[PDB]
RNA sequence: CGCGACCUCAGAUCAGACGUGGCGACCCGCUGAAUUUAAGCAUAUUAGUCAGCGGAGGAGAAGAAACUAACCAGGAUUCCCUCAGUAACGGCGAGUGAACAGGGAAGAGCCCAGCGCCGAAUCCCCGCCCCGCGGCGGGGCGCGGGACAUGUGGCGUACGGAAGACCCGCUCCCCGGCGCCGCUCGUGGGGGGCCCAAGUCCUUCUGAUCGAGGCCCAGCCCGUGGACGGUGUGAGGCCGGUAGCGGCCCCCGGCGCGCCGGGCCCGGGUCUUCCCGGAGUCGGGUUGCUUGGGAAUGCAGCCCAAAGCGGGUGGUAAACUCCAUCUAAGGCUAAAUACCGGCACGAGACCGAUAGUCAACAAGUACCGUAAGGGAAAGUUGAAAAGAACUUUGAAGAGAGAGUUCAAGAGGGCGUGAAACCGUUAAGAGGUAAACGGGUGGGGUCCGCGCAGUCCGCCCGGAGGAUUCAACCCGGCGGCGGGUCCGGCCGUGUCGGCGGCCCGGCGGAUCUUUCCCGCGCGGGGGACCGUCCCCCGACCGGCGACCGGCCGCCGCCGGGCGCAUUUCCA
RNA sequence: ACCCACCCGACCCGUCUUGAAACACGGACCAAGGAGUCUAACACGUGCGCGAGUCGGGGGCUCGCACGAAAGCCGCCGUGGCGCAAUGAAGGUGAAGGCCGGCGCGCUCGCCGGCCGAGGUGGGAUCCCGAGGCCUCUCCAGUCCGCCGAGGGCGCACCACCGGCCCGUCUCGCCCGCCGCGCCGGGGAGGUGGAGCACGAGCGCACGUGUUAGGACCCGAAAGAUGGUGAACUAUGCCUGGGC
RNA sequence: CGAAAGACUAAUCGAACCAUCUAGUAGCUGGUUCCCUCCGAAGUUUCCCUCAGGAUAGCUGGCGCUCUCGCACACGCAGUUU
RNA sequence: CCCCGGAGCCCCGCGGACGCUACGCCGCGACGAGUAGGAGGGCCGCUGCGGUGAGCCUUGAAGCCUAGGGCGCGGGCCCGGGUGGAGCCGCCGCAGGUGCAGAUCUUGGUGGUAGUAGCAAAUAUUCAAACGAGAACUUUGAAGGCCGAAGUGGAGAAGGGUU
RNA sequence: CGACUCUUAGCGGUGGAUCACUCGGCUCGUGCGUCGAUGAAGAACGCAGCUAGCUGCGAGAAUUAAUGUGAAUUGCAGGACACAUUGAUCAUCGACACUUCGAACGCACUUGCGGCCCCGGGUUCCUCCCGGGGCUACGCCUGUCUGAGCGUCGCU
């Protein structure tokens, strides 16, 4: 809010003794606007209070680090089938859930070329469900140009672009990243941590290269690692119905013994 | 009024600073302004390095730095002396010169020569016409390259 | 998108550019399309409506088959006023209803000489693309 | 008593030039408070901050060391990060508070006076010609004026310079024009103009659709275009646009080639002989301000007032002494930097008409004040004005009918139309002001019923009626689970191959310069170690990591089974 | 839940106050507006990442930014910050001890070889060992499985105590060292000051509370300062007119 | 400015008016916006140009941790008494 | 002295809820005043952002009103009907100029007071006519009155600015 | 029942909250970075067929020319134009024009007084008179012309 709001007027408070309050009155005049209410926060004109200012700290500094563990983990989820289901993805006939594809597709040059291939690789149902979801906005961020919204569609994982992003980019849904530059921004979005991608053999070679396996480092990230596991069973039904648990436990009381 | 523990601590704000907060939105629209100027600075001098004129090598000072090398403002007299580059012309050639620059031991001297005396080696002096004169190099080491050099020219390893 | 970074995409911009747009301008906006018969003849989508043009009315309570000549262009109302597209006033007086050129459609142009030449020059422009497109 | 030089001064509506005011976000020079903090206050602080005056530019200022340092030393200025809330200052309280180094952004360096040499070799203005002329210039020609020796120009300035002799190697740089060629990064520089994809297809809602299903061919078309706006609701395809190393036309810039006109005989090292520095300034004393700068950081006034192996600095006063380090008292200089004013654009997790600017509107308007100055309120009929013809009552405003509109339960301050408050209509009550909590009753308002609500569901027994089964085999498909791990793929731990090791790469302060290449160092090999991969065998976790057969079980389809069965229905 | 009736109960809220129904203040009524914010610094708590490190800025490389003024990467990855060491005003100094054997006279002092290597007491969650049961449809043999377990151990963290080491300081003492034998340098014993060491816990990011500096929860002075406008009223002087 | 009343100086005078510094400062008045749940004070200490305020103890809450054993097998602690 | 793919089960160690959003579900005891103040939970509420609901909406969104039906301890919420006429909400996250009865609070509006106070300075009006929808007030005529030339008369100055 | 009063609801008023819109703001960024004696900013007064305000312009006054565009402008009139033609209307804007105050310039601020050169009527340069035109600020520099001085000399 501009600096001047508010304090543009000249007024003094008429002290006490004339009935009236205390306030800030605009001084003179013969209008409407004259031994009024000037400056606080609460008068008609007035200034709101602790007016906002340019120099809130805006920008919020991660851990980098932290930054490539979240886009580990939603690479990690973007596999099971559940997590992107779950995230909306109507991924119901698609043949392999880390969908990777030819690398002709770096090719195509026309969106014609680009929708056809999502409809054989059944990628379509999503961006049917796109066309969908497009609808109003609610509310005043109509009048600031976000005027309409609509949903996040199949994220498409490139090595190169040899006209790829020219042909996806009228298919409404579909984001483009590089393999070279991923983003946690696109990879989960709302910070919701699952979403449909499609890779190419070329990109999704990469991706090891990049992020390092196990017992390699990066190569690419000078010196990073995957994160290291917590713990490794993760289905502890398979732990707790195990012969080497099961074997040391009291049987269990469990005979309801009510007032 | 201060309760039980803790720095008594001073800050600077008296004066009237909010009159003088100076905000940061500039710095990525800055960072592109140098960019993109810097990419038409290359672009002008054609074949020349983009990083400029060739430094010297030069040691810190103080016990602290000491051990410590760094690029230098320019190559000295006696290094243009004993390289044998008139001072004058090693300004045309991308040399750095300074000429405030003592020379206290030989050292630092002769390792300043032999960077200029490579740089000698390694520079594909263009002639002043198509037609060419004396020192200009072969239409070969020419044609093999009219490249610029990214980064700095014969970087400084401490 | 739009990628161009000096085009505006903001409601209040494009609105206020709009409505205070000058006549020149206005005719270009006051456009209206070409019947499909001349949309083959003339390889051309649509032409800016004048004075005394042929038209149908394809929308509205006016829509309908006739072919009325176009009687006035209304460029600060943004509307054109077309031969029996009409109404009673209270007092009998008929009275030129107002309708968009682009709810309209020109079956017959008035061909002048820069007419002709207009349409010389967006036929010529759709035949570049088609032969860069191949 | 003249005439003539010059000197110092006047006057011209003398010829020709410039300066004056504005703006002021940023910038330079002065000037300079007090609220305030210190829980009082006077030093301090607020603050070299507001107000005041001056002067600028697209930036300004600064800037090529009289610098840092004390190192094995750095090397103009500005800017950022850091130094650092540190050294220091301070009623050592409140509080205040830099610099060097280090890493970056940028990067660019120069010229006089003097000292000297050169016939003033220089400059300005006249006037005549040729070109050029919307940033008054080139070339030529004039016994045409003047400036200038009280010093103009070339060489030259501390990084040394000049003049000499011989060592060497050879000779393009600039401008005034006139042309002409390649339109020269948002991927054709800048500006202007004019252009460029696809449905108003079916049906159906609707006052109007832009809405909802649909549109065999793989999916209506287009899609480098599904930004945005407009158009009687919600529009990739109606229109303007949007996309595109898309088009055409203008103009202008910038750089490439040619010709002419001029200028321009412009090096380097080596040895010798010469040459060399800014005074009422430095410095001191002082008083006042200023600084973190403390026995004086910087600026001032006044007084004193210099030197030349001098002078300045070397963060505690002085003397002696060595070192280090610059060279002051003359000047110019792009760049990274700043920008709440201007012109022109773009955007927003902002505001949405008591908000957001004072100001969405004929706002710095009306209005007030002698004046300096103060300073509002105020957006919305409808898709379209189709804004109510006509009849009638009234002097008229106002009505009553009629009409327009999807609607006037939208009628020109008219979208929606809350509350306070008022009018009426209906119901109920009424001498302790009303109103309230708890508890019942009575009446109303609607709501659910029932014209039996006897509510359903299993299973069973009987009684009626109707289709094909189930049970079973047979053929097919699919699924599960299993062990023989049977056969093969799959992967964990271990051992064997030293096998990938050079046909496996990186890393290493491990080594070797027996190596190679480039100049004791750099790069690359070559050993070595660490790490990552092939080959087969063996043991073991045989792991949801899979296949193939076999087994068992399940399910579906079709075959079989026609009826003491298996269904349906009452 | 609308109205009415009746019995019982029942003073008007807000606020300051020991005390408010008060003869204490504010309040006729309704609508909209209206006050603990943001920045910086500190501290503690909590969450996450990495961990003797951590770090991201600032800068740079990748794009015309549609989404991007994002996202990514950097021998800059670390100049540098904080951290990993203190203590002294400073010059400076700077966290090890034990044991064993030998050689100097073991002199609770000086020098040479070997071994262990962050001391010890008490309490300590927890682990570990475990006599012994307690049965099995018989009399004994007898491996397997538990359940308990008297008794005994290693003892985390943490606490209390005693030792030890480092810096400052004092007191007392006796020896070593060498290019410079000196107003040189080094050690020992015993106290005592230190925001110390005694097998590390930090760094960055985020949220919360508290405390401050800022307009700093919102409203409120009397005043103070700078620069400007007024003698059309009125005060006094002067000029020129009028009136009694 | 005053034949003096601190009179008058544009309804303003024991220091005019206008704009700014200014959102001047306030240990003092006033106000300070939804629900349920759980715990729940103090007006006493010492210091203060302190007495209508702070500081510091106290009294409150929150976060915990370390242990204890009703899992036939308990140590320590108290607004008592012996 | 035999096997649950069958002991038939009050216990079943072969497999295991109707139950198991393990931030779930269930059982036993105890207890419950509260200013200032503190903490927790709010499927309480407001506005905007990333996600997400193949959400809702001209076959009627928001708002508004309702002696209609309900839920919740409560903040609040949901449905019916009316009115309205174009947008709007649920869930998971993030963000804040986020909830009013008070401030002699600010801006706007409205009451009671109330058809009340009040329309009393300076002696004065009456008759007829005209116009006119309409006359206590205009105009004309007639009468009765006042200002009483230091004027309620006739002309300027200043000031107004078309009166 | 009566009037009045209170309560609730219906409908109507008053009033303009709410909601929904937004050619306006607020903030952040980008590029450029240009006023003036050749008369600036600012002020004044003018100018439309009917026009008061806002805007736009300057006695050529809601504009002239030019170039681009290509049929309007429109509240009503009137008109033009041949929209097969420099051509309506917009846009651009390079030519032209630009009343009076204002640094503000003949001197004054009445809008008053002038001087000096030339031109037309007036004369027949007769000066008057009238009208038109061009000059007439201060400071300062380079030159120019006229000079001043018991300033310093020389010759006579
Ligand atoms: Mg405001
Ligand atoms: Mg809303
Ligand atoms: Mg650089
Ligand atoms: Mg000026
Ligand atoms: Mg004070
Ligand atoms: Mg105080
Ligand atoms: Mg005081
Ligand atoms: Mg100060
Ligand atoms: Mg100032
Ligand atoms: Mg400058
Ligand atoms: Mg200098
Ligand atoms: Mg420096
Ligand atoms: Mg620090
Ligand atoms: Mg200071
Ligand atoms: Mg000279
Ligand atoms: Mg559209
Ligand atoms: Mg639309
Ligand atoms: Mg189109
Ligand atoms: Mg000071
Ligand atoms: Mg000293
Ligand atoms: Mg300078
Ligand atoms: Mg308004
Ligand atoms: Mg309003
Ligand atoms: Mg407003
Ligand atoms: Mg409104
Ligand atoms: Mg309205
Ligand atoms: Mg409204
Ligand atoms: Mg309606
Ligand atoms: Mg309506
Ligand atoms: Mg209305
Ligand atoms: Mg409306
Ligand atoms: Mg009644
Ligand atoms: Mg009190
Ligand atoms: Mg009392
Ligand atoms: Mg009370
Ligand atoms: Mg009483
Ligand atoms: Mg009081
Ligand atoms: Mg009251
Ligand atoms: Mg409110
Ligand atoms: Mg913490
Ligand atoms: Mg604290
Ligand atoms: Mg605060
Ligand atoms: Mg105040
Ligand atoms: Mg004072
Ligand atoms: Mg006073
Ligand atoms: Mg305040
Ligand atoms: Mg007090
Ligand atoms: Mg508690
Ligand atoms: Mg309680
Ligand atoms: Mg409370
Ligand atoms: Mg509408
Ligand atoms: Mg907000
Ligand atoms: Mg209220
Ligand atoms: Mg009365
Ligand atoms: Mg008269
Ligand atoms: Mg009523
Ligand atoms: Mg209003």
């Given at each position: 809010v501009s600096e001047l709001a508010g304090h543009q007027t000249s007024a003094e408070s008429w002290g006490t003794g004339r009935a009236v309050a205390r306030i800030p009155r605009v001084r003179g005049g013969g209008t409407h606007r004259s031994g009024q209410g000037a400056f606080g926060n609460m008068c008609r004109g007035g200034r709101m209070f602790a007016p906002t200012k340019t120099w809130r700290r805006w920008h919020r500094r991660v851990n980098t680090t932290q930054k490539r563990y979240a886009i580990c983990s939603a690479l990690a989820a973007s596999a099971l089938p559940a997590l992107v289901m779950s995230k909306g993805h109507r991924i119901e006939e698609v043949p392999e859930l880390p969908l990777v594809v030819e690398d002709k597709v770096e090719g195509y040059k026309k969106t014609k070329e680009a929708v056809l291939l999502l409809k054989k690789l059944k990628a379509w149902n999503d961006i049917k469900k796109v066309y969908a979801s497009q609808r109003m906005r609610a509310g005043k961020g109509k009048m600031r140009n976000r005027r309409r919204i609509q949903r996040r569609g199949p994220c498409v994982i490139y090595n190169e672009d040899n006209g790829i992003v020219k042909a996806f980019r009228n298919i409404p849904g579909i984001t483009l990243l590089n393999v070279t530059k991923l983003n946690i921004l696109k990879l989960a979005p709302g910070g919701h941590v699952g979403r449909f991608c499609i890779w190419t053999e070329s990109a999704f070679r990469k991706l090891d290269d990049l992020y390092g396996t196990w017992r390699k480092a990066a190569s690419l990230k000078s010196n990073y690692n995957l994160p290291m596991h917590?713990?490794?069973?993760?289905?502890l039904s398979r732990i707790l119905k195990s012969p080497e648990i099961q074997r040391a436990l009291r049987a269990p009381r469990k005979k309801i013994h009510r007032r | 009024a201060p309760s039980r523990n803790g720095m008594i601590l001073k800050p600077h704000f008296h004066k009237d600073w909010q009159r003088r907060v100076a905000t940061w939105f500039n710095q990525p629209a800055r960072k592109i302004r140098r960019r993109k100027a810097r990419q038409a600075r290359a672009r002008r001098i054609?074949?020349?390095?983009?990083?400029?004129p060739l430094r010297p090598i030069v040691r810190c000072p103080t016990v602290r730095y000491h051990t410590k090398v760094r690029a230098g403002r320019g190559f000295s007299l006696e290094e243009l002396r004993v390289a044998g580059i008139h001072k004058k012309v090693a300004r045309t050639i991308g040399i750095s010169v300074d000429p405030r620059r003592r020379n206290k031991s030989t050292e630092s001297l002769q390792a300043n020569v032999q960077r200029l005396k490579e740089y000698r080696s390694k520079l594909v002096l263009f002639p002043r016409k198509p037609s060419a004169p004396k020192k200009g190099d072969s239409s070969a080491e020419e044609l093999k390259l009219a490249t610029q050099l990214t980064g700095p020219v014969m970087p400084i390893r401490n | 998108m739009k990628f161009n970074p000096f085009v505006t995409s903001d409601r209040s911009k494009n609105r206020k550019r709009h409505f205070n747009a000058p006549s020149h301008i206005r005719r270009k906006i006051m456009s209206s399309p070409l019947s499909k018969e001349l949309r083959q003849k003339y390889n051309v989508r649509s032409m800016p409506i004048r004075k005394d043009d042929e038209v149908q009315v394809v929308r509205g309570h006016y829509k309908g088959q006739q072919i009325g000549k176009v009687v006035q262009v209304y460029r600060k109302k943004y509307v054109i006023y077309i031969e029996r597209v009409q109404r009673e006033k209270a007092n009998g007086t008929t009275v030129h209803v107002g309708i968009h050129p682009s709810k309209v459609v020109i079956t017959r142009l008035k061909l002048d000489k820069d007419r002709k030449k207009i349409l010389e020059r967006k036929a010529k422009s759709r035949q570049v693309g088609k032969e860069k497109g191949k």
């Open positions: 917590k713990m490794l069973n993760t289905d | 054609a074949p020349r390095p983009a990083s400029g | -």
